[PDB]
Ligand binder design. Structure first.
Ligand SMILES: C=CCn1c(S)nnc1OCc1ccccc1
Length: 133
């Protein structure tokens, strides 16, 4: 019953500062432009201890499945090959991605009827808000 409030199908409704976040990550011009247009649907489900987060968009489709606290390999939408670990901290899903001596953290939380995603790379934050589809 851990992540019950996250489960469902969600659609992106707003984004702030995502271009600056992508720049800080190292994403190149053309990928930033295309990725920045996309309005992904995020599909979250749970089966036993395994959480699956799918992103379906016009830019890229991705899917990760994981157990909390247990590191996994992830290929991101912008084609980084990262090592990821996702934990639950006070009701917030905290997703750390490590690659090439770099790190970024993506936090997902329920706020009212929204699912709010905060993406941080060094001093740069982007906030992405999803609503139920
Ligand atoms: C980090 C946020 C996770 N997310 C959301 S929210 N929409 N798309 C996402 O994929 C990650 C990404 C896309 C493009 C460039 C770098 C990273």
């Amino acid at each position: 019953h851990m992540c019950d409030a996250f489960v469902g199908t969600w659609k992106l409704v707003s984004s702030e500062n995502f271009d600056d976040y992508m720049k800080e990550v190292g994403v190149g011009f053309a990928t930033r432009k295309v990725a920045g247009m996309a309005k992904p649907n995020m599909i979250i489900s749970v089966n036993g201890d395994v959480i699956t987060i799918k992103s379906e968009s016009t830019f890229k489709n991705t899917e990760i499945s994981f157990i909390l606290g247990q590191e996994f390999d992830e290929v991101t939408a912008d084609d980084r090959k990262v090592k990821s670990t996702i934990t639950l901290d006070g009701g917030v899903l905290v997703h750390v991605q490590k690659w090439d001596g770099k790190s970024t953290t993506i936090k997902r939380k329920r706020e009212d009827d929204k699912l709010v995603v905060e993406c941080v790379m060094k001093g740069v934050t982007s906030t992405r808000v999803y609503e139920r589809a």
